[model samples]
Target chain A: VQLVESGGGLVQPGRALRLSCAASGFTFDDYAMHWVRQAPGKGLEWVSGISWNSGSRGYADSVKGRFTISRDNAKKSQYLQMNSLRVEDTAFYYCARMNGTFDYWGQGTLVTVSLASTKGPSVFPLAPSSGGTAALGCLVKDYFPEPVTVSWNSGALTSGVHTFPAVLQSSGLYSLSSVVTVPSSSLGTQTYICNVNHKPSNTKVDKRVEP
Target chain B: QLVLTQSSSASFSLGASAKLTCTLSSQHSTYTIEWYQQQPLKPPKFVMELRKDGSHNTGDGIPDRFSGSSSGADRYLSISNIQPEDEAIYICGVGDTIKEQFVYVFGGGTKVTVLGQPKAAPSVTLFPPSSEELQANKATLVCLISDFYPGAVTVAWKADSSPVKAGVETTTPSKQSNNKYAASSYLSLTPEQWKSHRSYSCQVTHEGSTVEKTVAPT
Candidate 1:
């Protein structure tokens, strides 16, 4: 017995969504179905469900206002419909059969909420300082959609540069930084330019700092 | 919002009592709770319903060895004569009316281990992509799992370490002739998606341990 899920993948955040779970190998209407989801990198959360015999339904408090779980005996299917979706709604959704226990689960549907941000990255300069923070670098934060490229007008130097991995912040944005090493005696003689390219928005920002 | 609290993990000896707690938020001390058991790689099964008065009922087909009780905000699910199959995660749930609207709240599951239970881990093999599928512009990978007791196991796939969804299917396990079980899962992708990527991994979680086999384009 298996369940097939449809209506997953990239979807607009502000739009309504309707997902279907088609059941095979058993009587679909005889068993209740539940909707469960896990945000990317997060724990599972029970969303909503319906009772088979009574036709009653239950919803998670977080989705009470915009979620609906219903079934179709004719098609042997259950549908998960939602309105007012937000970036937080991006998750892998699954429908499980509830026969006193949730035994059969549909292969998860990865729902990606596409909330494109037109704004570009914000660049900040960091001057050489003491206590392990002594590197000349640039801090690039408050970017969206993740992918970014940072470059320097000076090109790849003999003393290579270090680019920290991008970190996704709680604000649904991303941040990263890049540092370049220079000789102590070269300070006050050179000026460096940090260029950040946020490809999605076709935006490029640069911060210049004196060595 | 209604809240249910569960310990991250709990362990008990085989054939001994397994007492699990699901603490309700103080404001909902009198609320009723339901217990569910999640076997490895399987979804949760309804186990019992508990009330604040220490009276409770179990779901249909639940064994007599499993029972529940409660006092104020603390709900209890007790399993007696724990078996090897009893090694699973247990979760608690509750329903309440918020502004006259119905809602369900579940606890982060408590992983329960039956200490000293006879444990046998499963073996996993991931086959590389097939050339025949490439002829059709499709790329397919197969994962085989065998020689495992307690047939319940979960299978997952990752493309460059991120979970892969869609174009994936795992079959129901079948019993082997020797009291063991075997299962297979498949991953299908566009040939381009497979060829361009670095690596793909098939991870099978069995007996609380995950065994992974990775494949790269040849």
Candidate 2:
């Protein structure tokens, strides 16, 4: 018994994607086909499944609205279609032969959702501290994927002084701000660097500011 | 909220009968239950729907070997003349209507194993519309699937390698005299799309392989 899985190369958010599983050797009509997914670096979750013969289907609670499962009995194949994909939907998907359990599995297909555009962070001085220290702020906006790592650097200025988590924007991207404080005496020639890292895009933006 | 529960596992020998149970929560005593069968690596098949009042409805094409009954808050699925292929996971679904929307809950699923079953894959073919038909501004392409054992398969149509969403109709797998199953699907296209000479394909997916046939207007 063999199952071949295909589809899913790259897709943009708000778009649709379709995956297929083809069965051979065994009687295709006797068993059902199920779709399971594992987000990049996440555990496997059941997406949905279908019985082509009866047109019966079921979905996991989380995927009920966004995913659809169907089959073409004449072709000995099953299909899993997802709509309005988001970055979080990026994952490896598999189609399996279902009897009482998943006794056979298809090769997993990796689906990637790429960001539409990229922009670097903007760095600026916030305000002067009571003790003559300079307070600096870094702003990163409109970046895909959340919880990006934002850091401040200047010739050995340690990052952990203060950090803020990334916040989701109405547009689905992320916006974040990080703060750093240094002696105002050094502000004369200080070169501060604001660095933002988004792993899915394999991109990092570095913005420099000098006083 | 309605809740359904089932045993973890059950077993029966080939040719013997097996009965599976699904129980509803006390608060849901008035709700009905639906039984589904899921084979390994496959999706669930709605087999029977049993109401609290004792009336039941079987899904289309469900064989007589499967039956359903209900007692109080408990629902049961019974399979007679069991074959090795009868071994599968059974699930019970319960739901209720609230605020004009339906809410559903599924049982954890019961596993059943019937030993020693044989199976086979289907052969699929795609037939494009005649030139005369296409010239008339409308066309119907047929996909025929035959000779598969155990009776389940999926058929899909694509135009220019993209899924065709509208004007597609498919038939349930029908049992053949030889014990195999056959089914077909139809894709309707407008003359403009047909005469565009774009590549059209019929794809069939079964247990272990996917086959496709592509054709273009001459």
Candidate 3:
């Protein structure tokens, strides 16, 4: 019912900025909540959605970098936390009902990022399953500071690309599942990586699945 | 993208008819708006939507006592044969048209005051604790109401209006700052029980007419 921005002193560039939307008066699950951004004169950009009950989060490909959207279903509030502030990051922030269209929006909050910080490298999981259809899932801790990437690798079977569904958590974390179908005859243990290129450390974690 | 707005309060005489109104936001004048009711200590129950051009789309199993209409950007909810049981708060909402999704854009809400020979109308208030901490069992529900003419009220726990066992408690209001008398009730039960219960209602009877509020968390 309400979206509140944590008021902070004039933040310098390269510093982290935290903005959130705290809701009340209704249950979180009653509707889907989303975060969007609009640069001073630019258009609106999609961020993500946090399911009130399941704690599921979904993000748009365009906002893969420089945004983090999370929700606390219990508190009936959704959060959007961004980091590595820069002049480009300076814009208006808004939270609205995620009803497909980017309408029905909240009054936007302004965050001005001064200068750019050291751009971080991207880190991802190891090679995904090769042969028989392999399923891979990724978990993301932050969104604003990182751009997530997923890839597959194979030895002799010729690695093919796979796409899976992802759910975003109210905490701005990301969870996705990728299923790559392979020939049943060629099934073996393989290492698949879901790498999230984040600022600061640029961390990567891999999961090995046996078929 | 649809937005909704509602009136602050409404009034109706017992056994008479009254229509409540909810105006759509400037941009969403033609969009649909839904109505919901939230009694003391309860989740909201969907009422119905008023389409553009003054038509009605009632929800499943809605009583004949409730109906909807629309004219211009204003939507209306008319409650007929009003009884003391209809003294709970009414909320108006609009669905999001974008994302092909639906969410109730809620208004501040309208308080319905019922008037009759019992003189004063009944009122209900619900309190919610523990914003977080979603463990499984252990939920404490508290409900309070005031301004009853005859002061004959009964609060019970039921599933679909059928009586069931509950850990409920009650308290009477004290004359501290004003001359108003308030009655409060409490129920302690597992979250499982609260979830499984179809709808729990607090019924207050006065002058052979009963006023009630129900909570159904789906």
- Name the top TM-score candidate: 1
Q: Provide the overall lDDT of each model, using Cα atoms, as 2-decimal numbers.
A: 0.73, 0.67, 0.54
Q: Model 2: which docking level applies?
A: incorrect
Please tell me which predicted candidate would have the highest DockQ against the true structure. 1
Q: With candidate 1 superimposed using the best TM-score fit, by how many Å does residue B90's alpha carbon deviate from the native?
A: 0.9
Candidate 3 regions exceeding 4 Å error are: A1-211, B1-3, B97-104, B117-181, B184-218
Cα lDDT over the full model 3 = 0.54
Docking class of 1: incorrect
lDDT per residue (tens digit) for residues A1-211 in model 3? 4455443223577667666666665556667787656566543444567665545666554445666777676656677666655676666666766432322345556565543232333222212223334333332322332223444442222244332222333443333323334455544444443434332334444434342
The CA lDDT at B213 in model 3 is: 66
Ten-residue region with minimum lDDT total, candidate 2 chain B: B95-104
Q: Cα deviation in Å at residue B38, candidate 2? A: 1.5
Higher-ranked by DockQ: 2 or 3: 3
Error of 1 at A210 (Å): 66
Please state the error at residue B73 of candidate 1 in Å: 2.1
Candidate 1 lDDT, tens digit per residue, B66-112? 98888778998888998767767788877666674446676888888
lDDT of 3 by residue, B112-178 (tens): 8776635555565443212121253345444555656544566665557876544555544322112
lDDT tens string, model 2, B1-218?
A: 56677898987866888889998989888887777675533444567778878888787557899988878888889899887556667877665656643245667778886643457788665555644445555576656667676567877788888888687766666554354567766676887787686778999888767878787775
For residues A1-211, write the lDDT of model 1, one tens digit per residue: 7888877655578888789988899885678788888786455688988888535888876887798777888888889898889889988788888655455677677676786644577566655532322346666655776556777764644354655455554466666656666766556666677878776567787778552
**Model 3: lDDT of residue A180:** 38
